[PDB]
mmCIF file of C-alpha atoms and ligand atoms in Angstrom:
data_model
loop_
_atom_site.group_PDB
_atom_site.id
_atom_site.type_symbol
_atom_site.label_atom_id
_atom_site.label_comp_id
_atom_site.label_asym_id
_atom_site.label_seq_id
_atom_site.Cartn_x
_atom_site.Cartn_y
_atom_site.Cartn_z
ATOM 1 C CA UNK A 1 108.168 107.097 133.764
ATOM 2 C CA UNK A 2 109.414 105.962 130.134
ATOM 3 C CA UNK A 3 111.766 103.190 130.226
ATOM 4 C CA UNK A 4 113.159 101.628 127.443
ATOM 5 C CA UNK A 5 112.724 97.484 126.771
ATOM 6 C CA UNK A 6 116.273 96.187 125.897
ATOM 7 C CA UNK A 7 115.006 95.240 122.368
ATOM 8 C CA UNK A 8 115.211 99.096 121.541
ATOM 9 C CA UNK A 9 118.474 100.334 123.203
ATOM 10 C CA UNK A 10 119.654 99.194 119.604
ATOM 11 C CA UNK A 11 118.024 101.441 117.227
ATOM 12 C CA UNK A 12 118.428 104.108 114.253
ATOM 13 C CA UNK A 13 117.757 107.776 114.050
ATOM 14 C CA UNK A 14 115.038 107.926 111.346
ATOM 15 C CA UNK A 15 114.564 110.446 108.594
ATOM 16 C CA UNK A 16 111.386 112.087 109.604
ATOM 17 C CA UNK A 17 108.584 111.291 106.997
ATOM 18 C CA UNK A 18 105.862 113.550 105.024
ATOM 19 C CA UNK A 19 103.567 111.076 105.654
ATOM 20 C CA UNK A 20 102.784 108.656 108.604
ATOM 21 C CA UNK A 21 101.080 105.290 109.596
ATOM 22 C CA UNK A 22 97.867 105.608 111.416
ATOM 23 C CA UNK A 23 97.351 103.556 114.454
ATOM 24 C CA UNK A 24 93.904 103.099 115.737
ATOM 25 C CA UNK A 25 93.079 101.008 118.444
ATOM 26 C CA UNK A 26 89.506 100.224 117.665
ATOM 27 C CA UNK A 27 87.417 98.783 120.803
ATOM 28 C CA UNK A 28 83.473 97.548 120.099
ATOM 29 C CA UNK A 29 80.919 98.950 122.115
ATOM 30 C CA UNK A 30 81.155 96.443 124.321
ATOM 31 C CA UNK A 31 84.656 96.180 124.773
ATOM 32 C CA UNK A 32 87.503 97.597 127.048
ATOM 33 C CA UNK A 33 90.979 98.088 126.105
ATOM 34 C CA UNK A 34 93.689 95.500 127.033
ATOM 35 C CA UNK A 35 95.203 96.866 129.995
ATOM 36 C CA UNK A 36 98.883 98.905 129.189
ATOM 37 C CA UNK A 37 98.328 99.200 125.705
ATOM 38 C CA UNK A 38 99.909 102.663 124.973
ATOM 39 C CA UNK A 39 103.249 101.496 126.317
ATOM 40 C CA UNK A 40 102.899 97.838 125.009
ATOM 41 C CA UNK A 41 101.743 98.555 121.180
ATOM 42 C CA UNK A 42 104.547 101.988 121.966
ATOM 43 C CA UNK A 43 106.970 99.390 121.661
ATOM 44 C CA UNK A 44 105.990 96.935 119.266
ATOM 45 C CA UNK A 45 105.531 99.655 116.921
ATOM 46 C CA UNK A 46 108.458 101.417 117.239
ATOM 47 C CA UNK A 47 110.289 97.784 117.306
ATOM 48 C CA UNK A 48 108.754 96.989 114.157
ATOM 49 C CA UNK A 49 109.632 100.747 112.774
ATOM 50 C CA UNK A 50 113.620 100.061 113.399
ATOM 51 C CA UNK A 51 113.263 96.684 111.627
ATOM 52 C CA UNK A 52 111.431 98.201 108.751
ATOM 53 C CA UNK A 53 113.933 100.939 108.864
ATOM 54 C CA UNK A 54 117.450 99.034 109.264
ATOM 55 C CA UNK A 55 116.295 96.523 106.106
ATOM 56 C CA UNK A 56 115.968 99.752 104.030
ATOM 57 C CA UNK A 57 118.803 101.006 105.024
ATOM 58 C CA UNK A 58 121.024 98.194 104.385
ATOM 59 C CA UNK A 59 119.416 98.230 101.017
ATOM 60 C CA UNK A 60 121.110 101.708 100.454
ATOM 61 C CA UNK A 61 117.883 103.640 101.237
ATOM 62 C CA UNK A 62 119.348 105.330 103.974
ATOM 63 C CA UNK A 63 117.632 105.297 107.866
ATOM 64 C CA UNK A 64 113.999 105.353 106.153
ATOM 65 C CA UNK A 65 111.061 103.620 107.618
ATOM 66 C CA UNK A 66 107.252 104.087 107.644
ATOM 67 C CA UNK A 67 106.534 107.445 109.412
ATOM 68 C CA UNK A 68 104.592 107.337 113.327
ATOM 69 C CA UNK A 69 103.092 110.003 114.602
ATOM 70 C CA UNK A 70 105.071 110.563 118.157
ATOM 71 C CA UNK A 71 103.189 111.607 120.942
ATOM 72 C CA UNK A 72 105.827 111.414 123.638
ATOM 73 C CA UNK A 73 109.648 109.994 123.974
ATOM 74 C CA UNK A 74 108.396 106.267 123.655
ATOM 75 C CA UNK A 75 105.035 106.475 122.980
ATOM 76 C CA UNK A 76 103.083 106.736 119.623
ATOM 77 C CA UNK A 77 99.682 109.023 119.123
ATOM 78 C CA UNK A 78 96.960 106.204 118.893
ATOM 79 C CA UNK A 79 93.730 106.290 118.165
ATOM 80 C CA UNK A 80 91.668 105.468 120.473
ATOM 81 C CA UNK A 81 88.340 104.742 118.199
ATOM 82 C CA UNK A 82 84.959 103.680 120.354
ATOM 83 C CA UNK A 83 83.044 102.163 117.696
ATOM 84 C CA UNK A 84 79.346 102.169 117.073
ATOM 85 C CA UNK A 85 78.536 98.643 117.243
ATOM 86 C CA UNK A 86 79.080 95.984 119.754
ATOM 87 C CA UNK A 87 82.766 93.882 118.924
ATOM 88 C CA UNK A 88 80.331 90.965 117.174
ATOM 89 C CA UNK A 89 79.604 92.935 114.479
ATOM 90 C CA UNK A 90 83.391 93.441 112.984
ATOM 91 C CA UNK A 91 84.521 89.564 113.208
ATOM 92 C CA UNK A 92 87.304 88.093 111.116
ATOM 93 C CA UNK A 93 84.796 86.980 108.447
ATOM 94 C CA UNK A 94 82.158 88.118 107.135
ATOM 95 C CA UNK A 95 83.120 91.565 106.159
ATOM 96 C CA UNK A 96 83.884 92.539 109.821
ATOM 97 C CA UNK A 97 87.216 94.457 108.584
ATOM 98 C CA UNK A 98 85.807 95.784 105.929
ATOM 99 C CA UNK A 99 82.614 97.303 107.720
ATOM 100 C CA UNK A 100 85.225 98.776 110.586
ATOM 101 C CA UNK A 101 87.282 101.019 107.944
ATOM 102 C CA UNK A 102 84.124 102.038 106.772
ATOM 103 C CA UNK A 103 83.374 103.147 109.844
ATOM 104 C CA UNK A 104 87.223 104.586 110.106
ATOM 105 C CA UNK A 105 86.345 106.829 106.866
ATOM 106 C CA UNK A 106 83.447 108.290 108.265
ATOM 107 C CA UNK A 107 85.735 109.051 111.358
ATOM 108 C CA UNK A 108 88.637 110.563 109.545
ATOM 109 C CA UNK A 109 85.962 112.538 107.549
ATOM 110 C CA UNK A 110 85.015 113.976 110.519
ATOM 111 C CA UNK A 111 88.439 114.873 112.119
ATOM 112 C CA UNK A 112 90.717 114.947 109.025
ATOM 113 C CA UNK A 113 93.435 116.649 111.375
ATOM 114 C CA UNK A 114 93.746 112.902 113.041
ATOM 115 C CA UNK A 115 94.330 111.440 109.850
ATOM 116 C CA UNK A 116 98.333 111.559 108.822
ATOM 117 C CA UNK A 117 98.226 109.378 105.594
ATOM 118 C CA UNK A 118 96.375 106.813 103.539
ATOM 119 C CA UNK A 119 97.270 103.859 105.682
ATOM 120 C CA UNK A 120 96.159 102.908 108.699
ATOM 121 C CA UNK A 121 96.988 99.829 111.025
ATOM 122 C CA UNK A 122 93.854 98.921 113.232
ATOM 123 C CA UNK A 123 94.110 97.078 116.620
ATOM 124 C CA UNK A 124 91.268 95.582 118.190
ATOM 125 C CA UNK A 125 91.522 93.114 121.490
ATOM 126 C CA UNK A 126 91.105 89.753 121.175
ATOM 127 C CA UNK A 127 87.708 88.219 121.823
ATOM 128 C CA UNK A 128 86.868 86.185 125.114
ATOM 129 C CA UNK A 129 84.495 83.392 124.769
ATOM 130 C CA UNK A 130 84.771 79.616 124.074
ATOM 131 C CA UNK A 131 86.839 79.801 121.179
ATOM 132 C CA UNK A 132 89.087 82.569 121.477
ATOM 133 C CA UNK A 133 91.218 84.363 124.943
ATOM 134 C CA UNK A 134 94.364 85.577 126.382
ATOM 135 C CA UNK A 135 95.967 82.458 125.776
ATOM 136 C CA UNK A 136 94.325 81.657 122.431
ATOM 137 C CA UNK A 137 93.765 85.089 120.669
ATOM 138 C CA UNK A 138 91.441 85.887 117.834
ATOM 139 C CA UNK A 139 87.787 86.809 116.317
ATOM 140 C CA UNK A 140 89.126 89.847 115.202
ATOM 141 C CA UNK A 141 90.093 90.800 111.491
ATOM 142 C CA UNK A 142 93.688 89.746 110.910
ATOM 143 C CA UNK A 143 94.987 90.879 107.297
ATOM 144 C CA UNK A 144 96.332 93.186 104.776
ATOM 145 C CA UNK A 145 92.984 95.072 103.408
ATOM 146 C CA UNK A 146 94.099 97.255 100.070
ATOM 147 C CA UNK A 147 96.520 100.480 102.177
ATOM 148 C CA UNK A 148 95.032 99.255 105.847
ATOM 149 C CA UNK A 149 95.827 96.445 107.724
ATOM 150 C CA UNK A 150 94.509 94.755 110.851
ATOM 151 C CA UNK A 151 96.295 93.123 113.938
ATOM 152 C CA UNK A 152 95.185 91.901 117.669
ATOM 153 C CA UNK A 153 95.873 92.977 120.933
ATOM 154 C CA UNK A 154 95.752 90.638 123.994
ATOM 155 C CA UNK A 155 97.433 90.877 127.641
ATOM 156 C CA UNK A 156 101.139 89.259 126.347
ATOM 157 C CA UNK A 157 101.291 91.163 123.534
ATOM 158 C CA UNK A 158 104.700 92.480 124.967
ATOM 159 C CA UNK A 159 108.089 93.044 123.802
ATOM 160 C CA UNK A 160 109.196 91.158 126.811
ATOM 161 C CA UNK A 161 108.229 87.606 125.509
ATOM 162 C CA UNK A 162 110.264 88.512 122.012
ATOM 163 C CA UNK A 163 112.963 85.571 121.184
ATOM 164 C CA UNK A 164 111.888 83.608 124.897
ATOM 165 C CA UNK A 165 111.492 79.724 124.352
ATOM 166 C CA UNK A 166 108.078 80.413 126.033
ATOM 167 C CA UNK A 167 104.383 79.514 125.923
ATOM 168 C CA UNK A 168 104.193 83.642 125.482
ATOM 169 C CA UNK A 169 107.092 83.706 123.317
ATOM 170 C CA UNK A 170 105.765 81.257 120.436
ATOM 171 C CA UNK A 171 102.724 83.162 120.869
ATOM 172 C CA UNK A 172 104.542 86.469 120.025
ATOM 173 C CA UNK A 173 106.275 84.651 116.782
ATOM 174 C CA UNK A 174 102.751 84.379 115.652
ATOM 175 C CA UNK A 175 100.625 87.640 116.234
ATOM 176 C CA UNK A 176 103.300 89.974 115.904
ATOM 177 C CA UNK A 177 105.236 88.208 113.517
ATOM 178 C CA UNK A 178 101.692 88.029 111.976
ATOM 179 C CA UNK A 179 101.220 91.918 112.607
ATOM 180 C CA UNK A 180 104.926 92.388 110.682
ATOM 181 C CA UNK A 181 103.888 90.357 107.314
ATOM 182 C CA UNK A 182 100.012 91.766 107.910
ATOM 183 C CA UNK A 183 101.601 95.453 107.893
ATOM 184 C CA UNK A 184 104.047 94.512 105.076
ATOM 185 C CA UNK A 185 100.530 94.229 103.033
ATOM 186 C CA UNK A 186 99.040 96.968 103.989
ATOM 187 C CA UNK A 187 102.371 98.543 103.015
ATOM 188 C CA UNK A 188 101.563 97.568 98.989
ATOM 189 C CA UNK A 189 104.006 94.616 99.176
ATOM 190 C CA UNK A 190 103.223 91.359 97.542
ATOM 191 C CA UNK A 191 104.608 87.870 99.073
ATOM 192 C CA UNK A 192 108.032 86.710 97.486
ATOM 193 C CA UNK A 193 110.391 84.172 98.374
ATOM 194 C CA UNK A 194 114.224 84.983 99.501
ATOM 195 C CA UNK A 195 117.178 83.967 96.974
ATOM 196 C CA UNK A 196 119.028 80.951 97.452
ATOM 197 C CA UNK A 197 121.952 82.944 98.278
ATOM 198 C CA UNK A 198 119.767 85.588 100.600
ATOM 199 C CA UNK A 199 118.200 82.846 102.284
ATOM 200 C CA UNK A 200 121.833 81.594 103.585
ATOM 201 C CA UNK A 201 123.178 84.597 104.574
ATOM 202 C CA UNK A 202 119.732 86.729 105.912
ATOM 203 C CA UNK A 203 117.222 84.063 106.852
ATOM 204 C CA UNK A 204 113.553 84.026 105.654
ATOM 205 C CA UNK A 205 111.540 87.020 103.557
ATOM 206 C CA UNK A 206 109.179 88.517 105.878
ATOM 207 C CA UNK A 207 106.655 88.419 103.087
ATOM 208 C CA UNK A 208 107.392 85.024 102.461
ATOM 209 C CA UNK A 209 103.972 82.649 102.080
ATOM 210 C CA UNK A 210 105.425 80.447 105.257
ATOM 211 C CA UNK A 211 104.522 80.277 108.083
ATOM 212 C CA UNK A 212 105.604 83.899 110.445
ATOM 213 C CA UNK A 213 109.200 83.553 111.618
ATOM 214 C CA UNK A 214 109.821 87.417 113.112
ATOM 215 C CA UNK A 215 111.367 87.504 116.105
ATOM 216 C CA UNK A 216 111.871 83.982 116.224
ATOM 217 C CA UNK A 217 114.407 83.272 113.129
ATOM 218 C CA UNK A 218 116.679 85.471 111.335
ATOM 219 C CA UNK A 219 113.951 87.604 108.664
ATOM 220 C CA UNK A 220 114.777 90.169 106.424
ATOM 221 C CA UNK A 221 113.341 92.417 103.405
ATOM 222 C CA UNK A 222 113.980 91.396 100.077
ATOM 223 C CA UNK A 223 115.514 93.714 97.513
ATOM 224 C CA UNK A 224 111.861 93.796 95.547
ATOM 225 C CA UNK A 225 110.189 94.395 98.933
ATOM 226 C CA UNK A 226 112.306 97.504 99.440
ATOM 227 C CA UNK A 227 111.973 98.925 95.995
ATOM 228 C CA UNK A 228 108.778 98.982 96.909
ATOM 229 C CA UNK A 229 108.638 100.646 100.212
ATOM 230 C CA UNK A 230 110.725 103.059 98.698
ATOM 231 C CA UNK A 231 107.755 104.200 96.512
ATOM 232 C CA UNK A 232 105.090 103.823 99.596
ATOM 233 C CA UNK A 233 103.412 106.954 100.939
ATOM 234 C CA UNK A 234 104.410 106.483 104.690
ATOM 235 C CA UNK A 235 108.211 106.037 103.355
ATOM 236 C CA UNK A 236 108.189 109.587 101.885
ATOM 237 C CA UNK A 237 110.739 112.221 102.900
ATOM 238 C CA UNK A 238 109.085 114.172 99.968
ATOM 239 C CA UNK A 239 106.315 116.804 101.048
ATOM 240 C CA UNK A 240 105.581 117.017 97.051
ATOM 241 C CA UNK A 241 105.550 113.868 95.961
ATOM 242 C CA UNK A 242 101.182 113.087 96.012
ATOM 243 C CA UNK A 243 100.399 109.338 96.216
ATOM 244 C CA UNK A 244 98.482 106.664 94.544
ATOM 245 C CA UNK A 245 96.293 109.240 92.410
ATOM 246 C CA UNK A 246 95.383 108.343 88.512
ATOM 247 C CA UNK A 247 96.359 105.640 86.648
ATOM 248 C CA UNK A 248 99.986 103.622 86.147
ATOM 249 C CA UNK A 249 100.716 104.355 83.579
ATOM 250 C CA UNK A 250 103.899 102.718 81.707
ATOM 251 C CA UNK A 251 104.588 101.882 77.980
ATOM 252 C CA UNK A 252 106.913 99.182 77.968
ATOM 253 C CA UNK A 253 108.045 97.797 74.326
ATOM 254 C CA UNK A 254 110.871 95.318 72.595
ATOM 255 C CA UNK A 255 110.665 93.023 75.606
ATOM 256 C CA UNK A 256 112.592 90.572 75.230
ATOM 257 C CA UNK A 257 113.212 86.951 77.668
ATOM 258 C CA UNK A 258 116.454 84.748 76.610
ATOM 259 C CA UNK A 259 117.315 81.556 78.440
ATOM 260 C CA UNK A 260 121.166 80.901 78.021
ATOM 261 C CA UNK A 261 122.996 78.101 79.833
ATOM 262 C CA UNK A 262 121.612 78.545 83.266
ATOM 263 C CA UNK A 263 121.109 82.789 82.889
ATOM 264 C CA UNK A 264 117.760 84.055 81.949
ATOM 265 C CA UNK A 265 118.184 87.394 80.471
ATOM 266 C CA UNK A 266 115.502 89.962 80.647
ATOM 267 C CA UNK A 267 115.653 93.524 78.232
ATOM 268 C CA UNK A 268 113.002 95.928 77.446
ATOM 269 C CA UNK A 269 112.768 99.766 77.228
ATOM 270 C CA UNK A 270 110.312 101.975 79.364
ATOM 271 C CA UNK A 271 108.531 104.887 79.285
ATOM 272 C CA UNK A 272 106.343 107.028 81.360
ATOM 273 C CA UNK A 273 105.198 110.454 82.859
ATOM 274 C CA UNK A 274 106.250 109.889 85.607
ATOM 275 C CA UNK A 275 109.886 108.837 87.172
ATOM 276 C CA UNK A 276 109.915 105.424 87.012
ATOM 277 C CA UNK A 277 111.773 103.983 90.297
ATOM 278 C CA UNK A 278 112.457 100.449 90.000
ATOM 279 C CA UNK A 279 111.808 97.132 88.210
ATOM 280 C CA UNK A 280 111.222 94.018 90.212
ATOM 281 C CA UNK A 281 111.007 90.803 88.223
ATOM 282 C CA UNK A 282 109.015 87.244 89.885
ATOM 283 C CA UNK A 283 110.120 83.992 88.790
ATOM 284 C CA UNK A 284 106.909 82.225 89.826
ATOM 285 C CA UNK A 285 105.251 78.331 89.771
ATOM 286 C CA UNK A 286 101.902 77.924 89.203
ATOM 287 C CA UNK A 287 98.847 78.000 89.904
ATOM 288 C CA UNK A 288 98.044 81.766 89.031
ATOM 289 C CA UNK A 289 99.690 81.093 94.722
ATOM 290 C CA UNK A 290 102.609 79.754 96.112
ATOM 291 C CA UNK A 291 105.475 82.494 96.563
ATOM 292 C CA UNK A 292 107.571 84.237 94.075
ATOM 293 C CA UNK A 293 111.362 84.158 94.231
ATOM 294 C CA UNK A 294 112.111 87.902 93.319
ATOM 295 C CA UNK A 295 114.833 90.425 91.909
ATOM 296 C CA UNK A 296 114.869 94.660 91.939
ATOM 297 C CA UNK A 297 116.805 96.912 89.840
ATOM 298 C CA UNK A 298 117.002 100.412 89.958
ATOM 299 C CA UNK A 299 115.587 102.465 87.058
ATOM 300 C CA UNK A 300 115.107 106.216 88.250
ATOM 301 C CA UNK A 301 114.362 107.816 85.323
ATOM 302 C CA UNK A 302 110.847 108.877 82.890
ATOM 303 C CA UNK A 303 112.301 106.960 80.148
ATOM 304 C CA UNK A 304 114.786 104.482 79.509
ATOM 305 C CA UNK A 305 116.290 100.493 78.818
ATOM 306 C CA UNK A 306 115.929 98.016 81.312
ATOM 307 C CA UNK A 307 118.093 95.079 81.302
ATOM 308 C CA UNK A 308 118.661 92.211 84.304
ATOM 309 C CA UNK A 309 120.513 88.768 84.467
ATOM 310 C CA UNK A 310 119.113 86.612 86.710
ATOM 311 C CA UNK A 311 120.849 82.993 87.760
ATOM 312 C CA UNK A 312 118.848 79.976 87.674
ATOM 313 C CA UNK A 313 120.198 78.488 90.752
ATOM 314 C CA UNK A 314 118.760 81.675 92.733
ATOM 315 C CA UNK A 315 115.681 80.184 92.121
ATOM 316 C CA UNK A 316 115.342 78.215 95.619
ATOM 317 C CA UNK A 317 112.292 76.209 96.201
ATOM 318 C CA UNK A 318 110.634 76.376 92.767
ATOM 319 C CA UNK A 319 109.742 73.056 91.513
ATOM 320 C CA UNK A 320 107.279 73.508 88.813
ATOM 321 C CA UNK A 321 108.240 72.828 85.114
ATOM 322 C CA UNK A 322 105.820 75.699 84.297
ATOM 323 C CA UNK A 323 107.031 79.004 85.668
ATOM 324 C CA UNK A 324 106.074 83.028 85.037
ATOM 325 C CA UNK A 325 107.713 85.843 84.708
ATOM 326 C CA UNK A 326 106.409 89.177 86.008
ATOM 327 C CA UNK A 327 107.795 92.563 85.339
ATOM 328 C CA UNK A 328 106.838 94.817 87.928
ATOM 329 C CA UNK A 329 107.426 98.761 87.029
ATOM 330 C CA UNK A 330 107.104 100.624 90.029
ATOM 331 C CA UNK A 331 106.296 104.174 89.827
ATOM 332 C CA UNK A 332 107.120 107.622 91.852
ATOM 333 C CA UNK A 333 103.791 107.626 93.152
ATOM 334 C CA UNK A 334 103.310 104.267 94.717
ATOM 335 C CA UNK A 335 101.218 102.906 91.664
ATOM 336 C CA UNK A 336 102.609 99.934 89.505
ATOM 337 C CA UNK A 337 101.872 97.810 86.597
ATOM 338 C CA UNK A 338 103.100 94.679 85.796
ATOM 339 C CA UNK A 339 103.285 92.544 82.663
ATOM 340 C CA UNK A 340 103.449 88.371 82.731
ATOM 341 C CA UNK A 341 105.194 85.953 80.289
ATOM 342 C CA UNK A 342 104.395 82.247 80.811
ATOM 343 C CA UNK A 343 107.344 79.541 80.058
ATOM 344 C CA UNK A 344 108.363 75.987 80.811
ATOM 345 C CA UNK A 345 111.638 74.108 81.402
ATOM 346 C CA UNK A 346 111.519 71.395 79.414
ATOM 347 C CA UNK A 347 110.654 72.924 76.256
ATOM 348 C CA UNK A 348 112.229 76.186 76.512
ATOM 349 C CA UNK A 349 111.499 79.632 74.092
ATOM 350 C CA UNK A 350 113.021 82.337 73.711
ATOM 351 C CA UNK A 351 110.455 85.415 74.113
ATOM 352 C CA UNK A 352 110.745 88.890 71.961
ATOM 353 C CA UNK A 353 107.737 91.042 71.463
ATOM 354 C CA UNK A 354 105.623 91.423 68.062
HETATM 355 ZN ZN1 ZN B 401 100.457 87.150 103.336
#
């Protein structure tokens, strides 16, 4: 019978979605699956959901996370994928993640009905040899791949161990903290670094360049990591909205970058077929990568002026006296384009455009 860990009796109702994350647990030829893993990844995934889901809606969002296909109270619909080749022939390097969505395609091509958006999270157990085990997991692909991502699976990968000042607790911090960044790539989202004033009061940016710290600090979503869920496929509550097709297409013009006192004033106008959602601006050191401390504003229109203040003392842990500014126009469809102005402290200019 379903029971529910304590980590969920906490949780939002969720809008339901137009669009959902795959989950395929992908096992080698060779290989078995790690023993309870419907109810274990169950609630990991649905953990990770309400986090994913709470950060956008304190963001003013509303209760809107990245969609699961529900198979049961509790329990997702995974894939269970037996692949062709024995588990040594999709290793972390090497191309191993990039031969097993390959094989994924060919899959979904087969059985499009399975197949519930463009991303798709893919589990595979951890090896067991000389290197790698349940208490040492790995030799498995472990990253953000363009809309997919990869994770691990291995015997404590339980909701149990989440927060416990254990051997299986630290190792939770790192694979499914790992798994929440991982996903956050998959997800389209870039790294950035919190706000001085966000990192007091929230914690840590989950897709900060750091090392993981979900489940084991206090982690949150920036404001430009929301702006952009908000445009990501498995966010939609929008049956009509069609994602990530063509080209982004923006024409920005009279851009113009002011440095006053300790404010740095960005202006330009947009334009662009289609509804442009947000702008998120990244205050980065070189080289061009160590993270970006960003900003989001709302646009929400085809056409229009854009205009953002940013403080200098946000700008927490950037040391560099070169630094870059991106502006990152996000569009209805997930696409994005972004344009990059290069600058240094100690001899400061004022940017306009030709
Ligand atoms: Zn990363």
């Amino acid at each position: 019978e379903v029971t529910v860990p304590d980590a969920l009796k906490d949780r939002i109702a969720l809008k339901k979605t137009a669009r959902q994350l795959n989950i395929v647990y992908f096992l080698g030829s060779d290989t078995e699956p790690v023993p309870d893993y419907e109810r274990r990844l169950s609630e990991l995934l649905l953990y990770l959901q309400q986090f994913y889901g709470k950060e956008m809606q304190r963001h003013g969002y509303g209760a809107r996370s990245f969609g699961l296909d529900i198979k049961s109270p509790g329990r997702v619909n995974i894939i269970e994928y037996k692949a062709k080749n024995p588990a040594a022939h999709y290793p972390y390097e090497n191309g191993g993640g990039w031969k097993a969505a390959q094989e994924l395609d060919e899959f979904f091509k087969a059985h499009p009905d399975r197949k519930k958006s463009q991303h798709t999270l893919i589990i595979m157990p951890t090896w067991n040899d000389e290197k790698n085990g349940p208490d040492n997991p790995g030799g498995v692909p472990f990253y953000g791949m363009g809309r997919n991502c990869f994770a691990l699976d291995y015997p404590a990968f339980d909701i149990k161990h989440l927060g416990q000042k254990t051997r299986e607790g630290r190792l939770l911090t790192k694979w499914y903290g790992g798994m929440a960044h991982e996903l956050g790539h998959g997800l389209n989202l870039p790294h950035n670094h919190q706000t001085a004033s966000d990192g007091k009061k929230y914690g840590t940016a989950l897709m900060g360049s750091g090392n993981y710290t979900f489940g084991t600090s206090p982690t949150f979503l920036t404001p430009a990591s929301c702006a952009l869920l908000d445009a990501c496929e498995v966010f939609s509550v929008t049956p009509s909205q069609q994602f990530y097709e063509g080209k982004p297409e923006v024409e920005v013009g009279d851009v113009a970058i002011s440095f006053k006192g300790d404010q740095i004033l960005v202006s330009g106008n947009y334009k662009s077929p289609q509804t442009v959602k947000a702008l998120n601006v990244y205050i980065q050191d070189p080289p061009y990568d160590y993270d970006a401390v960003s900003f989001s504003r709302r646009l929400g229109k085809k056409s229009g002026k854009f205009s953002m203040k940013i403080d200098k003392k946000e700008l927490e842990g950037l040391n560099n006296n070169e630094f870059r500014i991106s502006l990152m126009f996000i569009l209805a469809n997930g696409l994005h384009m972004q344009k990059h102005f290069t600058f240094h402290w100690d001899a400061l200019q004022d940017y306009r455009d030709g």
